[PDB]
Every structure is written in structure tokens, then in C-alpha cells.
Design a protein around this motif. Structure first.
Motif, PDB file in Angstrom:
ATOM      1  N   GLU A 196      -5.597  -1.974   8.938  1.00 20.39           N
ATOM      2  CA  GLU A 196      -5.051  -0.622   8.870  1.00 20.39           C
ATOM      3  C   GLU A 196      -4.938   0.033  10.236  1.00 20.39           C
ATOM      4  N   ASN A 226       0.851  -1.181   0.000  1.00 22.03           N
ATOM      5  CA  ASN A 226       0.000   0.000   0.000  1.00 22.03           C
ATOM      6  C   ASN A 226       0.884   1.227   0.000  1.00 22.03           C
ATOM      7  N   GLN A 231      -1.955   2.048  10.552  1.00 20.66           N
ATOM      8  CA  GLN A 231      -1.018   1.598   9.553  1.00 20.66           C
ATOM      9  C   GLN A 231      -0.700   2.702   8.545  1.00 20.66           C
ATOM     10  N   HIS A 287       3.735   1.418   3.110  1.00 20.54           N
ATOM     11  CA  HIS A 287       4.211   0.243   3.800  1.00 20.54           C
ATOM     12  C   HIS A 287       4.071  -1.013   2.930  1.00 20.54           C
ATOM     13  N   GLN A 328      -0.348   6.207   2.667  1.00 20.40           N
ATOM     14  CA  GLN A 328       0.307   5.012   3.154  1.00 20.40           C
ATOM     15  C   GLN A 328       1.558   4.759   2.371  1.00 20.40           C
TER      16      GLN A 328
HETATM   17 NI    NI Z   1      -2.439  -0.374   4.400  1.00 17.08          NI
END
Ligand code: NI
Length: 1352
Positions: free
Chosen positions: A320, A273, A333, A295, A293
């Protein structure tokens, strides 16, 4: 020019150009779909060890900021860490030249200083598709002589590499002590903590903080596998297992570390993501947020006892965020600090401090909002496209069909109003067809009658333009909607009124500290925002005006904004949209100061508009459909994204291309084009070409092959907005005027001017070369910045065809790409396409071999919505016969550019070059050129000579029929009469011709010539024709098959022949044509069809005087009256023609053949322009005032008189009943006196200028004198026209053509006044007679449309 390759471990290689540090490097290759904020992005610690592929094709526009400056806290002032953190960078196009008020140097220089490799010229979309869904793609940027091996940086503890090595304190003295565990924290986390009163103690990732004193603890990070951080995981575990209750807030890596410490598992995602448009859902209360995001590792969804999920990803269902069931521990997240990205989740910092401040082991849930049943609708009334509003004159909007489609899917019955019987909107027979259609005017009276008859419980009033909005608002105000129980669906009328009134608007905005003086030179930015009933709110598109209402060159996305500017405006958009209670779509326009953060709001539009239409076409996001679903109370996450299929309407599109929209001016705008490219230069030159076939691209030469005047004031031309300003800019640059000066004079941001300078430098480079000396590299580059084969041919001294051949011999060709709304984050099966030289692969297969159908290009005078109807019918006929279709068009105002109605839609140039590109790449089975007006038809022969199979009438015959000399010789042989004519070269040849047939004469490049002097001026090859005076004009629309006419319809113009034939009002069947003339018309049509072997549609125009019938011309294609004639006769002429052209058999038994016509007995049909306005020949060839017009209204009536009155009401006028201004030429008095008496006898009070009023009175027709506008205040006795029009004393103006140069200005002013005040204006004598006859016969108004059934 130094080069390098990106090489992936799977074998993929792409060659590019170095713009960073020239050394090789290996790492993980990743992509990020975020468009803005590259400087902030590349200083994200989460990119450590990664080679970043940018989705945004155009990188570097704002240079690099001050990279050494610190803020008051001792952090980098403009960046998110202390340096560039990516290992390398891959981009499509690098802007060497930058322009932004914070810039201190170029991006390339910055990358060089930091020792970071970067290449441009690589297909980042192709890379994204390769990397996507493959957990770890390793790669390297490799320079010749500097080989490196693949290495995976995730196998080392990257957390440790990026973490501070010592404890650092920020916000010393602040009252709330927060420990921040550095796993690669971004600076904005610290800024947001300190701003909220934290003293931040930033500690190393492995610092034993477990016995420290603090009020709160935060763990933040980006890079690496969190499982390699065991000492940190252990320390967090000690906290979780102790009695300590300080709030804990994890961000990204913090979510993984906290989860691991609690006993959950982590895994490396196969689809990471990475973007700024990642939608997440709060599981507790169902609120949706757009997030940033970055990660590649995630938490397993199975959590240990005591922990619960807090947020979930809407697209891929991954965790998340998490929370403890009772303790104030939670994590996300995503990055609520963004930078770059949407400022939608910053409230999580407030939450953190609330948990600290309350401090009695509260839960995260209790410091966030709690959970909240929707509108029930059985029948909905949709107001379609309507008549005139004052100011929004000529506007049309057919988005109501998308509403119909949305309602049908939800089993809601639909009623649609549209007064035009030949409208494309009502030419629908599937999901877009309303259950009931009323062909009534969009006015309060008629809308009220439909409500009484149908009893809808819902109304949609924001999808038919201004007139429909005003009509709906008016009904609300009068209590009609309340009385009949009709809910306004979507945004409430209260809210709408607040956006329509400037004062109320200002008031409402002040309640949230937003405000509204000269803002010229400020950047103009607009956003399209969607908000659902549950308060979910997304920004779907943003746009930047290049020049300086809706007549600008526009690009999407915006190109010259920083993250900070973009997100500040986005945020304001969302706040304004919430505060106004928008439920549906909204447009908001901003002016932004070019060298600061100051801005203001210019306006908000809470109905569908030109901008919303442009935004849908630019993004592939179907605003109108989604807005209709939202109006039923359906939230965004519960609605499907129709392009990806797998995801929802709750997201913000990422574009991996750029769009350019340019108005089409009359050669104040009459249409527009949109082009797609992956450089600004490609998009921009394409869009210019799309405007008119005489425009080559961006050059210092004018359209229509005109030369610049010798007395030209170039600075003056630059400082005045006009239709030729772009060419003047090209000239200014070429004449070595500095870009700074051009910027000063034009207000065009210098960034755009650098791109324009680069185009002109390429033209210079090409002029020095030839077909032997021009390299592959140079030619490649030229095509990539939008040069056509035609432009290149002129520079090299070749023909277009030789240049194409040279280019293909080097295997340089364009690539077909999808508009997928997501920058390839997810596979699309979309068939919405464009073509670009900036790529290394095609996005689709070429196995359909479909039938190509060419569209009409931009609308302009004489080429309007009628060809949209013809395209729709032709495309549908093919589909119904199971034939695959390929549609090509570049007009964003069309319905036929609907990717759900054809199998492939190319939103592309209608040039020979680009049509050949598409046809040969698809290997189409054929091409229809007959249903898109003049543009496609002029390409017939060139296409035919280049291997294209044209369907229907042979291109050789089209060439014969439209060569005047050959056409005319063929008529002679056939003994068909025509108007005597001649092609002239010398001025003397004109006098010689005019002599032998008398004045006046006509002229084609259509203008009239009264005298010899007048002829002299016009030549600043030309054809002269004599039209007879007092002739009628007749149109023959027909379909031929193997030279036989198998369908036809004859219509008569109201106007005598001469005043342009393309804004003539048509009557069907004929009203005042002799029977013998009709027979001659038929016979000449029979012969013409056989002489050119016609198979397909065609049109012939005739002059008729008594029994004399003269052919004027023949167009071997469908005409603008095909829809009218089809609906009037009950037979689709395009369907018949399309069948004939592809060889599909047709039953002629019930068709209107020459032997058995279809002639309506019980009704007549009229077709009139939607809108007409005056034009002054101020250009100075002659001083005269003409009318121009656009659009269409068609109606049926028992006779032509009632049809005419219905057309007047359908155009939004009130039938006059009070007073009439009479303007006529003095020499026309004897011919007019009869009609003047007749109008007066009907009870109209007559007004006229003094001499004409005296003349009327002396002839016993009462009349009141008024003043010429230029003579107001020279006689107090006489009243002013403007005043009498305002009091309602005059509700009709007759203003007939007038040659007297003394009063041309006043007559223009009178005409302009009538139009501005929204009262009917008659400028032709026959039309005036028709009106006088019609009011005599008529009454009230509802009676004319009184539920009559019309057929056969
Ligand atoms: Ni994510």
C-alpha cells in the motif's frame, strides 16, 4: 418505463430500469463498497471505462450538486474532476425524489446530461459476489435494438485519455512550486496542496518535467494499467537516477509509476481494492489507518534495492506504499485526499511539505511518528445488569456475558455479579458462563464485599448500564479500588467522569475547539466509535433519527448526509474519542444544521448503551466482545472479525442494506424492533408491522383498529411527538397536505416523506386493480417496497391466503441474504440472515432442515426478558441433542438472537407470511411456538393450516383451550369450578349480567368496573367476569407429556386477585394457601392436561378463597414464571418441555410430578418487577391512576420476608428506616389502622395529608401532617412532600388505590415523585403488610445475603 440489461461476459443477465442516458455501453464491471459520496465518486477519473456497481442500495438521495460552479482556483467546486467519469452505473434503488440543501437537480438528470447510462433494480450484492476475485469482469448495459460487443478499456492507455493536454497552474503566486503529474488526478489533491502554500503546475502525464525547476513533485492518478505509461515511467526513472533531491510524493497510480520507475513489477489484482473502509498498517510503527482506495493494479511485494515498503494492507497483505531508504521519495496506494472517504491520512500532505521545507534529503520516516507492553490480568470482576438509577430507570444490559466470553478466551478468570437468580445473563453453561457468580445487588457496599472475597485485579464497569457505571465510579472515588489493587479496565474513571458531567465535558471539548440553546429541527446523527489502547480508532456504525431521547425512529446507515457532512462528523468523533482517552466503545451524538455545515455535540456515552446494542445487531460487529478484548490492551488488528473469520476487528463495516429501528409503545417506550430491507420502504413497513400485530404497515389507519376522532386537529397531531404521529403523517399525506408543510410541522426530512408518499401511491395503484388486472411488474414492486400479502389483499378484494397463492403462481418470492459486515467484499460463512424481495439469489444453502424456534417480538408490558431466558434454554436443549436450529426474532434487546448459539438466525418479522416464507424455504422439520409468549402461540392454527409441523401440543387443542366458550364447557363437564363470566354485545346485556352476580366486575378487550356509568364509557366483542373479593391468586406452571403432568410448580401472588396478574409479585412455594386448595389446584391441572392432550409447557391461573378454587384461565404455552420456577426448583422446565415436544425421552424419577412435588423447605423464592411507574388515565375514559411495571428481580431468602427485603435491595432501593408517607382512601381506614400502628411501633415516623394525619393522631398513632401537592403554599404551617423526600425525612411512600376523582391527580403526582426520587413505592395493601412484617423480623443488610447455599 424503459428497461435494459446488465450482461456479463460469463453469461449473467439482470434486467433493470433505465434512469440515465438511454443508450448501450460496454466496459469493465467493478464494485465499490463505499456508502457515501456518490457525486464525488462518479467523477473519480479512476473509473474511466468502468461500469460501477454501488454497494449502497439507496442511491440519489441528495440529487446532484451545482455541477457548473467553480471555486476560486478554477476547479469544479463540488466535484472531483470536470465531469462524470464512469461509463455506466448499476444500483439497487434509485431515489427519483431528492432532498439536500446543495441539490440543484436529480442524479438521473445529471447522468442524462453527461450521456451516462444507468439502471436500477438490479441485485448489486449478487453482482459484487460474481465480480469479486475475478480479475477483470467485462460487461455491458444493453438496450433493446442497440447491441454492443464486450470491450476491455484497460487495453488502451486510459492515463492518456484522462490527463490534461496542457500545463495548468493553480495557486498562482504561492511560494512553494509543486509539479503535479496528471495521471487522472482528483481535484482534492490540488485543493490540499494549494491550501498548504503550493503553486501547482499540473502537467500532462507525458510532459518532460525532468529539467523543470520545482520544490516538490507529486504524481497522482486513477485509471488504467500503469505499464502502458512508459514515457512517464522513463521520465520518473531519470529523476530517480539523477542527483535531484526534491521530495517526490506518489498517490495510487503514483505508487505504481514510482515503483515501476525504480525497477519493481506491477500486476492486475484478482481482488481489487475499492472502498472507503480499507485498513492499512504503517510497517515502521504499527499504526493503523482506514483509507479510501480505488485501484485494480498493485505493486509486487519484492522491491528493488534502496526501496522499502511503507504501508501494507491488513486484509490481503498487498503493498500500500513505498519509500526510498534515504531520499525524500515516497508513495501510497490509497488516496489521502479522499473525497469520498475517511479523513485519516491527510497528514501525508503535511509530511510532503515538511520534507520540502527541511530539505536535506531527510527520509519519510523522520517526518512521521516513531514506534512506542500491556495490562496483565489474572481475575476480572464484571458488573452485570443491576437496579435503578435516577433517570435511567428500567434499563437492562446483558452485554457482560460477551465480556465473560472474551476473558475466557484469554485465560482470565471471571467473576460476575447479577442479583436476579432467574436472569438470562446467568443462564449460561459454556464460554459465556462466568467462573464464579455472585447474586448480589450492584451497589458499592456489595461490590466491595465481592472484591474482598475474590481479590480481582481487574474491574469491568461499563457493561451493566448506568447503575454499574455509577457503582464503579463511586468505588474509585472512595479509594476502594486503590486499596484493593483493582485496575479499572478500559476507559479510566477520570475520562468517564468527564463525559458524565456537563461542565467538565464542556471544558474538555474546548481544549480542542469543540463546543455545545435550541437545536430542534436539526438532524440528529450518532456514531459508534471503538478505540484501542494503541490509539487505533474506527467508526463502526452511524445512525440518523427520522423523527424528533432514545424513542425515535432510527435508520442505519444515515441516509440524508453528503460526504462532506458525514466525514466532518466522523472526524470530530475520532478526535473527541482520542482526547477523552476512550479505550473501548463510545457513542457520540450530534445535532447538524439541516441547511449548512454547522453542528454541535449533544453527548458522549462511554459505556455500552441501547445504541451500541442496536449498532451490533445492525452491522454484525460484536462491540461488547471487542470492547472487552480492548480492555485487556489488545489492539484492533490483533482481534478477529467473527463474521468473515479471515479479517480483523480493525475495519469499518459496509452495509448493503438499510436498518430501521422503531420504539414499541404501550398500546416512555417499553421496547423496540429492528427490521432489515434493501429499500427504505421495505425496512420501514416491516418494522412497523413488527411493533404490533394490528399494524399493517405504513397506512393512515391507527393501531388496534381505532378510528380517528371527528374533532381531529391534524396540524396539532403532527407538531406533537407521540406514539401515533406516524399514522397521522400517513393521514396528512392522504388528505393532500403538502410535504413541505409536513416537514415544517414534524421536522422529518422531506426525503423520508417522499418515500412515505410513494408507499401511499402504491396503495392507490393497488386499489384500482384486481387479481386479473394486476401485473407481475406492479406486484413485484409492491413487495419490494414492503407491502404484505395482507395489505395487498385488502386493495384487491381477496383473502390473505388467495393473495399469497396469486403471488407464488407468478413465482414472486423473497430471497435470503447474509448480514456479512463487508457488503460481500469477502465471502462470509455467517448464519446471520434477513429476507428481502430486492434480490435475484439466496446467499445460503437449505440442507439443514432444522427445527424452528419462534421468539417473542418486542418487549412491552406483560412480555419481558423472561421469554428470552426460555428461548435460550430451548435453543440450547436442541443443540445439545445435536439438532439444527433456526431462530426467528426481531427484538434487538434479546440475548437469544445470538448467531453463535443457533445454526441459523433470521432477524425477521413474526408474521404468518414471513414465518411461512422461512419455514418452507428452509424446509424445516418442525416449529416450536410454545416459548415465545403470545405472538407465536396465536399463529399456531394458521401455521398448521399452511403445512407447518407444530411440535408438542396440537394446534387444534391450543385453539380449544384458548376459546373461552369451549374451554369453559370442558371445565363444566370435568366439574372444575370457574369464575362466572359472559361475552356481551349490547350494553344492556352487561347490566343484566352485572345484576345477577353483583359489582365490581372485570373487563377484557384488563380493567375493573365499579358502577354502571363506568361500563357505559368503555365501548368507545367484550368479555365480563366476576372475581370474588378478597381472593388469593395462584399460578400453576407445568409441563405435560401425552396429557400427564410430569413437572409442576405452584406459586402464590402476594397481591389479592384483581390488580393485574402480570405485575404481581410471586412467592414459591405457597405461604397462605390451604392444603385442600392445593389439592384441588393439582386435581384441576391433572384434568386440564388430559382434556387438551398436553405435550409441552402450560400455565393455569386460579382464584383461591379458603377452600374454593376457581380456574381463571389457561395458557397453553410457557409463562413468564418458567425461569423463576426452574431456578427455584433446580430443574429447567423448558429443557424438559423441549425434550417432550421433540420426542426425546425423559426420566421422570427426579422431576416434580403431581405425585411427588419439589417443595423447597429451607428457603423461599420471590419474583418481583424490576421497575414500576404510575400512569394516569388522561385519555378520559375514566379518571384513574394505575401502576405499570417491567423487568424481573428474583431472590431466595430463609423466608418470604427476607426474600422480599433482598428483592427491594436488588432493585436498587435502600431499606427504609426513617419515615413513611401514608396515602389511603378514607373508606379503607378501619382496615389500615393496624398496619399503621405496626409501622410506627417499628420506629417509623409517619406522614400523611391532613385529614388522614388527624385521623391517625385521634387513634393514638403519631403522625405529621403534610400538604396535597396541588395545595402547597395555601398553608405555610404544613410541609411539602417533595421537600421531605429531598431531606431524607420520608424514605418510603405507601399510596393505595383511591377512587376519589378529586385526588387522582395529586396521587399520581405523589407516586411520580417517589419514583423520580428513587424511593420505594408501595401501592398494594398486601405488599404493605408484607413489608411491615419484614422490617419487624429484620435487623444489617450484608447479613441477608451472607454466603448461604440454596438447594432442593
Ligand atoms: Ni490497496
Amino acid at each position: 418505463a424503459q428497461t435494459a440489461h446488465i450482461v456479463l461476459e460469463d453469461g449473467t443477465k439482470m434486467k433493470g430500469y433505465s434512469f440515465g442516458h438511454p443508450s448501450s455501453v460496454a466496459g469493465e464491471v467493478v464494485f465499490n463498497t463505499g456508502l457515501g459520496g456518490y457525486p464525488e465518486a462518479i467523477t473519480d477519473p479512476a473509473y474511466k471505462g468502468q461500469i460501477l456497481t454501488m454497494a449502497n442500495p439507496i442511491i440519489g438521495n441528495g440529487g446532484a450538486p451545482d455541477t457548473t460552479a467553480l471555486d476560486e482556483l478554477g476547479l469544479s467546486k463540488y466535484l472531483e474532476s470536470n465531469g462524470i467519469k464512469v461509463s455506466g452505473l448499476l444500483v439497487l434503488d434509485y431515489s427519483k425524489d431528492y432532498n439536500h440543501w446543495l441539490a440543484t437537480k436529480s442524479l438521473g438528470q445529471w447522468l442524462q446530461e453527461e450521456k451516462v447510462p444507468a439502471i436500477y433494480g438490479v441485485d448489486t450484492r449478487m453482482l459484487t459476489k460474481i465480480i469479486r476475485d475475478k480479475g477483470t469482469m467485462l460487461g455491458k448495459i444493453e438496450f433493446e435494438g442497440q447491441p454492443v460487443d464486450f470491450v476491455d478499456p484497460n487495453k488502451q492507455n486510459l492515463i492518456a485519455e484522462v490527463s490534461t493536454k496542457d500545463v495548468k497552474v493553480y495557486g498562482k503566486g504561492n511560494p512553494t512550486k509543486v509539479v503535479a503529474v496528471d495521471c487522472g488526478i482528483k481535484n482534492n489533491v490540488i485543493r490540499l496542496l494549494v491550501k498548504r502554500g503550493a503553486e501547482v503546475h499540473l502537467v500532462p502525464w507525458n510532459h518532460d518535467f525532468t529539467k523543470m525547476e520545482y520544490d516538490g513533485i507529486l504524481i497522482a492518478g486513477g485509471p488504467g494499467n500503469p505499464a502502458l505509461a512508459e514515457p512517464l515511467i522513463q521520465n520518473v526513472r531519470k529523476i530517480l537516477e539523477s542527483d535531484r533531491k526534491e521530495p517526490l510524493f506518489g498517490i495510487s497510480t503514483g505508487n505504481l509509476i514510482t515503483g515501476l520507475a525504480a525497477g519493481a513489477k506491477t500486476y492486475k489484482m484478482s481482488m481489487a481494492n475499492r472502498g472507503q473502509n480499507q485498513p492499512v498498517l504503517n510497517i515502521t510503527n504499527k499504526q493503523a489507518f482506514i483509507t479510501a482506495q480505488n485501484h485494480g493494479y498493485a505493486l509486487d511485494n519484492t522491491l528493488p534495492a534502496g526501496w522499502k515498503p511503507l504501508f501494507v494492507n491488513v486484509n490481503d497483505q498487498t503493498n500500500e506504499g513505498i519509500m526510498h531508504e534515504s531520499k525524500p521519495f515516497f508513495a501510497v496506494q490509497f488516496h489521502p485526499e479522499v473525497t469520498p472517504g475517511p479523513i485519516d491520512t491527510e497528514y501525508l500532505f503535511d509530511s510532503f511539505f515538511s520534507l520540502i521545507k527541511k530539505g536535506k534529503a531527510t527520509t519519510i520516516t523522520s517526518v512521521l511518528p516513531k514506534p512506542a507492553s500491556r495490562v496483565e490480568v489474572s481475575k476480572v470482576l464484571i458488573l452485570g445488569s443491576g437496579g435503578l438509577s435516577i433517570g435511567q430507570a428500567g434499563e437492562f444490559d446483558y452485554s457482560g456475558s460477551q465480556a465473560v466470553k472474551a476473558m475466557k478466551e484469554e485465560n482470565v478468570k471471571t467473576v460476575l455479579m447479577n442479583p436476579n437468580i432467574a436472569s438470562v445473563q446467568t443462564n449460561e453453561v459454556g464460554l459465556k458462563q462466568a467462573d464464579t457468580v455472585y447474586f448480589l445487588p450492584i451497589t458499592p457496599q456489595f461490590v466491595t464485599e465481592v472484591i474482598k472475597a475474590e481479590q480481582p485485579d481487574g474491574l469491568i464497569l461499563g457493561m451493566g448500564g448506568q447503575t454499574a457505571l455509577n457503582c464503579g465510579v463511586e468505588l474509585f472515588k472512595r479509594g476502594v479500588l486503590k486499596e484493593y489493587g483493582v485496575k479499572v479496565l478500559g476507559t479510566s474513571v477520570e475520562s468517564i467522569m468527564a463525559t458524565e458531567d456537563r461542565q467538565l465535558f464542556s471544558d474538555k471539548l474546548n481544549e480542542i475547539n469543540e463546543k455545545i440553546k435550541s437545536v430542534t429541527g436539526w438532524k440528529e446523527i450518532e456514531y459508534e466509535v471503538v478505540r484501542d489502547a494503541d490509539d487505533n480508532c474506527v467508526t463502526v456504525c452511524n445512525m440518523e433519527n427520522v423523527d424528533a431521547t432514545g424513542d425515535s425512529v432510527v435508520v442505519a446507515p444515515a441516509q440524508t448526509l453528503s460526504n462532506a457532512e458525514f466525514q466532518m462528523l466522523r472526524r470530530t468523533s475520532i478526535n473527541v474519542v482520542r482526547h477523552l482517552g476512550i479505550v473501548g466503545e463510545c457513542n457520540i451524538q450530534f445535532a447538524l444544521h439541516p441547511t449548512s455545515m454547522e453542528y454541535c455535540i449533544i453527548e458522549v456515552n462511554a459505556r455500552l448503551s441501547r445504541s451500541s446494542a442496536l449498532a451490533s445487531k445492525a452491522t454484525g460487529y460484536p462491540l461488547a466482545f471487542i470492547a472487552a478484548k480492548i480492555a485487556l490492551g489488545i489492539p484492533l488488528p490483533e482481534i478477529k472479525n467473527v463474521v468473515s473469520g479471515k479479517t480483523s476487528a480493525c475495519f469499518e463495516p459496509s452495509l448493503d442494506y438499510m436498518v430501521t429501528k422503531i420504539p414499541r409503545w404501550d398500546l416512555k417506550s417499553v421496547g423496540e424492533v429492528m427490521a432489515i430491507g434493501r429499500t427504505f420502504e421495505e425496512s420501514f413497513q416491516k418494522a412497523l408491522r413488527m411493533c404490533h400485530p394490528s399494524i399493517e404497515g405504513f397506512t393512515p389507519r391507527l393501531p388496534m383498529n381505532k378510528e380517528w376522532p371527528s374533532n381531529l386537529d391534524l396540524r396539532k397531531e403532527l407538531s406533537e411527538p407521540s406514539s401515533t404521529r406516524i399514522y397521522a403523517i400517513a393521514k396528512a399525506i392522504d388528505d393532500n397536505m403538502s410535504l413541505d408543510e409536513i416537514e415544517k410541522l414534524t421536522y422529518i426530512d422531506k426525503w423520508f416523506l417522499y418515500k412515505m408518499r410513494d408507499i401511499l401511491n402504491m396503495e392507490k395503484t393497488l386499489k384500482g386493480l384486481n387479481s386479473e388486472s394486476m401485473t407481475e411488474e406492479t406486484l413485484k414492486r409492491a413487495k419490494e417496497i414492503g407491502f404484505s400479502d395482507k395489505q395487498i389483499s385488502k386493495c384487491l378484494g381477496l383473502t390473505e391466503a388467495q393473495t399469497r397463492e396469486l403471488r407464488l403462481k407468478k413465482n414472486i418470492h423473497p430471497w435470503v441474504k447474509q448480514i456479512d459486515t463487508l457488503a460481500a467484499e469477502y465471502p462470509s460463512v455467517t448464519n446471520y440472515l434477513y429476507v428481502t424481495y430486492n434480490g435475484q439469489e439466496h446467499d445460503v444453502n437449505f440442507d439443514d432442515h432444522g427445527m424452528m424456534v419462534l421468539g417473542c417480538g418486542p418487549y412491552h408490558i406483560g412480555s419481558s426478558v423472561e421469554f428470552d431466558w426460555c428461548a435460550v434454554s430451548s435453543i440450547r436443549t436442541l443443540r445439545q441433542l445435536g439438532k439444527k436450529t433456526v431462530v426467528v426474532n426481531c427484538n434487538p434487546e434479546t440475548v437469544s438472537t445470538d448467531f453463535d448459539e443457533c445454526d441459523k438466525l433470521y432477524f425477521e418479522e413474526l408474521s404468518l407470511e414471513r414465518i411461512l416464507d422461512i419455514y418452507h424455504q428452509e424446509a424445516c422439520g418442525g416449529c416450536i411456538i410454545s416459548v415465545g409468549g403470545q405472538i407465536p402461540n396465536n399463529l399456531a392454527v394458521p401455521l398448521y393450516k399452511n403445512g407447518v409441523k407444530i411440535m408438542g401440543t396440537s394446534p387444534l387443542q391450543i385453539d380449544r383451550a384458548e376459546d373461552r366458550s369451549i374451554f369453559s364447557a370442558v371445565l363444566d363437564e370435568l366439574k372444575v369450578a370457574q369464575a362466572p363470566w359472559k361475552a356481551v354485545n349490547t350494553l344492556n346485556e352487561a347490566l343484566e349480567f352485572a345484576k345477577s352476580v353483583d359489582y365490581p366486575c372485570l373487563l377484557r378487550p384488563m380493567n375493573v368496573v365499579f358502577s354502571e356509568d363506568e361500563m357505559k364509557k368503555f365501548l368507545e366483542p367484550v368479555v365480563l367476569t366476576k372475581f370474588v373479593e378478597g381472593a388469593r391468586e395462584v399460578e400453576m406452571d407445568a409441563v405435560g407429556k401425552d396429557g400427564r403432568v410430569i413437572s409442576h410448580a405452584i406459586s402464590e401472588h402476594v397481591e389479592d386477585a384483581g390488580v393485574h396478574s402480570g405485575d404481581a409479585t410471586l412467592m414459591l412455594p405457597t405461604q397462605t394457601i390451604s392444603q385442600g386448595a392445593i389439592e384441588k389446584v393439582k386435581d384441576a391441572t391433572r384434568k386440564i392436561a388430559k382434556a387438551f392432550a398436553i405435550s409441552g409447557p402450560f400455565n393455569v391461573q386460579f382464584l383461591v378463597k379458603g377452600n374454593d378454587v376457581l380456574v381463571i384461565e389457561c395458557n397453553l404455552r410457557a409463562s413468564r414464571s418458567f425461569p423463576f420456577v426452574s431456578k427455584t426448583l433446580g430443574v429447567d422446565f423448558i429443557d424438559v418441555a423441549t425434550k417432550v415436544m421433540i420426542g426425546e425421552n425423559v426420566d421422570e424419577k427426579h422431576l416434580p410430578t403431581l405425585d411427588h412435588p419439589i417443595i423447597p423447605a429451607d428457603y423461599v423464592a420471590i419474583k418481583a418487577p424490576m421497575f414500576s411507574w404510575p400512569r394516569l388515565r388522561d385519555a378520559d375514559p375514566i379518571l384513574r391512576c394505575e401502576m405499570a411495571s417491567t423487568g424481573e428481580v428474583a431472590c431466595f431468602g430463609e423466608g418470604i420476608h427476607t426474600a422480599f427485603l433482598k428483592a427491594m435491595l436488588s432493585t436498587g432501593f435502600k431499606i427504609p428506616q426513617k419515615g413513611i408517607l401514608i396515602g389511603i382512601q378514607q373508606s379503607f381506614r378501619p382496615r389500615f389502622l393496624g398496619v399503621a400502628e405496626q409501622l410506627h411501633n417499628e420506629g417509623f415516623k409517619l406522614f400523611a395529608t391532613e385529614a388522614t394525619s388527624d385521623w391517625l393522631n385521634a387513634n393514638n398513632v403519631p403522625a405529621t401532617p403534610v400538604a396535597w401537592p396541588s395545595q402547597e403554599g395555601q398553608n405555610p404551617s404544613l410541609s411539602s412532600i417533595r421537600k421531605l423526600i429531598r431531606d431524607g425525612s420520608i424514605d418510603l411512600v405507601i399510596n393505595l388505590p383511591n377512587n376519589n376523582t378529586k385526588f387522582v391527580h395529586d396521587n399520581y403526582v405523589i407516586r411520580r415523585t417517589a419514583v423520580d426520587s428513587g424511593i420505594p413505592l408501595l401501592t398494594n395493601f398486601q405488599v404493605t403488610k408484607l413489608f411491615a412484617e419484614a422490617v419487624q423480623k429484620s435487623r444489617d443488610s450484608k447479613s441477608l445475603f451472607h454466603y448461604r447455599q440454596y438447594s432442593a
